[PDB]
Design a protein around this ligand. Structure first.
Ligand SMILES: Cc1cc2nc3c(=O)[nH]c(=O)nc-3n(C[C@H](O)[C@H](O)[C@H](O)COP(=O)(O)O)c2cc1C
Ligand SMILES: Cc1cc2nc3c(=O)[nH]c(=O)nc-3n(C[C@H](O)[C@H](O)[C@H](O)COP(=O)(O)O)c2cc1C
Ligand SMILES: O=Cc1ccc(O)cc1
Ligand SMILES: O=Cc1ccc(O)cc1
Lengths: 399, 399
């Protein structure tokens, strides 16, 4: 059915429908599909889904000039730890991603691959099976109860990475970014948000190292910045984006409770503008908003109101993508896109509405999403949400 | 005469006229007098002016419950370097400040002493005369042309402070804060803005040290934070304020051009809130706005619009005083004081208008200031600006 007491608002008279150039791509509107894990990849191999993935992305690439950031894709087997999320390291995976990138490009939309490394969010037991380490920034701070339950049954204890093994992850980031561009993606987003490995090094709670990778603002940022710099040497700055969630608490990050958190993220933004002066301005910075500090909480739950992401605009002067409970708030979006360099990511309602961009443009009602199929191994809840037309033919009231 | 095409606006219906508690003081309105050097102190001795200073401050303390921050006062002779600015280190100076604090308190207003240390802004030649060093954070970066002219004629070269001599300045800050409270002041503001010594250690341009006082965000903040902590042990956190000018460029500071500047100031704000959790919340944070990056430029000149001070509010959760070209902009003030913990400093128009607070409350015209007497050794341009009544009796049109 459609979302119930939601009064939609048409947004075609705002800057969300003005064109903008992001990297090499000339987007025709500013509503982007943020990275969304759907756990339909095939095991063994972490292979993109052979039956359903091309249709899923072809459906969401239907409005020309749309920017799509894929689900997170593991850069290597050691980066992974979930059986049904995709990778971008082997020839069998890239054969299937090529077909997804060609289908999106035949629709005249764009496709950026999100590069993912789990760290302590990985299941230690899957990893133990495959012969791999359970990695994080440190060894004396765990994610939570059941993650330490997991690890000890599995006898796969949380490991602090050596400098050596941080370098190897940089090596794999470059290869996986080379692979995504060689199979035809328009660019890559470095996932450094939502509590996964690079964010575990950025956060003072998860990073109690005392070497060059821990202990100060600058050292805590060091791994994310080396990854930026290596991918910018490998494939060019106009093909790299960075995602940050300053105020997130998902996967045990500190959020607004850490008093030093704005300075930690202001430093990363200033180093990026530094590079932008020196010629290497990243295609964009993608921010998760305090409106959503945990993506497993229903919209409106877990909103952090003691801080804001607006400090990034005083520092970084390129495009920023902002995401977090914006589909149900067109009155908030109308204000945020008066800024001429701001794009809005829509996550959960792009899951239920293949044709979201038309619905935004025209103020049409919004299909409810079914949380129960976010992570099912099914076409149901994945490729069968109707467009507005089909939804009327189905009687979602109006028939 | 009155300011010419200025249309005033009455502000008595805003939060500028609601009471607020700052430290121990219950202010009756939120228009504060920011620190303003007027160079009427007597040489030798840096003695507050024996003839005119009590009247100057008594005139500006006329509206009950006003917070007044004094002109900068040197904590010791090595901190100084201008002959006619006051000090707060000797018995002869404190005899005269006592009389200023008693006169302000008989008017039922409050008085906070700004503690000043010049660093590289000092005249090296006055210092050479008196046997004192020309100090700064570093020795290979100078303030400007004529300051190095000065120094070499004077044969008094710019010196990088040793740890030892940084400790001695902390010793003198505590004594001078003990002296101000013992003579009767309500509190002290630590001057760490506008390019003077503590700001030279905070700024990456002026601070090229590689020891524990330079080289990173945390080390660059170290001297300002040790001074906060020493004065909070000495006299209590509800008697200490801190002034910061993130975006200032006066006295050769970096301003918005340094990409790392917001992170440098976000770190200082986060450490202060850290302490606020641990029980020691400073009475206030005083910020100079990007609206004024050099106080020698006429209002509207040198406005920095690529950044904002609003990031401090996501981090520090106590009172903030904001200053910078707000007297000519009541439409801007009306918006800024919707925030329930914001006070507005008025510098240059509190020089020409002893009765500014009534004029703000009622929307009355504003006396022009005479820049030519900001630093003269005269009563003229100091104690003879009229109140609105006297100005009408004088015919400043209306007679
Ligand atoms: C099912 C689901 C999967 C997600 N997968 C990812 C992911 O792979 N990487 C990522 O950075 N964010 C991920 N997110 C976070 C979203 O990109 C987004 O920031 C969050 O949902 C807030 O936007 P929303 O309120 O519009 O949905 C996911 C969110 C959901 C609900
Ligand atoms: C004559 C004059 C003397 C000043 N003296 C000081 C001082 O002693 N310490 C300080 O922190 N700021 C000093 N300032 C800066 C002001 O406090 C204030 O931040 C600046 O004037 C901007 O406010 P305005 O636009 O209202 O005047 C001075 C400014 C002027 C014009
Ligand atoms: O729900 C899956 C998920 C994956 C990666 C994220 O970044 C956030 C959520
Ligand atoms: O004009 C004098 C002056 C003194 C101290 C400051 O902080 C700023 C200006």
């Amino acid at each position: 059915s459609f979302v119930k007491d939601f009064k939609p608002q048409a947004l075609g008279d705002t800057n969300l429908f003005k064109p903008i150039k992001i990297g090499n791509n000339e987007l025709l509107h500013r509503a982007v599909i943020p990275p969304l894990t759907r756990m339909r990849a095939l095991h063994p191999g972490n292979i993109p889904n052979r039956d359903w993935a091309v249709e899923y992305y072809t459906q969401r690439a239907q409005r020309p000039g749309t920017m799509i950031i894929t689900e997170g894709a593991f850069i290597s087997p050691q980066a992974g730890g979930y059986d049904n999320a995709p990778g971008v390291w082997s020839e069998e995976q890239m054969v299937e991603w090529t077909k997804i990138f060609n289908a999106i490009h035949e629709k005249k939309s764009f496709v950026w691959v999100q590069l993912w490394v789990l760290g302590w969010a990985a299941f230690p037991d899957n990893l133990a099976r495959d012969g791999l380490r359970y990695d994080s920034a440190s060894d004396n701070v765990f994610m939570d109860a059941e993650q330490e339950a997991k690890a000890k049954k599995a006898n796969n204890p949380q490991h602090s990475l050596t400098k050596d093994e941080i370098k190897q992850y940089i090596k794999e980031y470059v290869q996986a970014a080379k692979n995504s561009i060689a199979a035809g993606a328009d660019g890559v987003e470095i996932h450094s948000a939502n509590g996964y490995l690079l964010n575990q090094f950025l956060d003072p709670h998860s990073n109690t190292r005392t070497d060059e990778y821990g202990g100060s603002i600058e050292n805590r940022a060091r791994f994310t910045l080396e990854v930026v710099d290596a991918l910018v040497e490998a494939i060019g700055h106009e093909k790299v984006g960075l995602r940050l969630s300053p105020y997130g608490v998902f996967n045990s990050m500190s959020g607004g409770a850490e008093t030093g958190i704005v300075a930690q993220y202001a430093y990363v933004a200033g180093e990026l503008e530094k590079r932008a002066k020196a010629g290497k301005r990243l295609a964009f910075v993608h921010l998760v908003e305090p409106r959503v500090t945990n993506p497993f909480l229903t919209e409106g739950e877990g909103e952090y109101e003691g801080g804001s992401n607006d400090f990034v605009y005083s520092i970084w002067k390129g495009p920023v993508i902002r995401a977090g409970n914006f589909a149900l708030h067109p009155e908030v979006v109308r204000e945020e896109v008066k800024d001429k360099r701001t794009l809005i990511g829509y996550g959960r309602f792009f899951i239920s509405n293949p044709d979201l961009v038309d619905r935004l443009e025209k103020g049409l009602p919004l299909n409810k999403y079914d949380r129960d199929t976010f992570y099912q191994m099914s076409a149901h809840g994945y490729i069968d949400y109707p467009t507005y037309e089909e939804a009327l033919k189905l009687g979602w009231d109006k028939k």
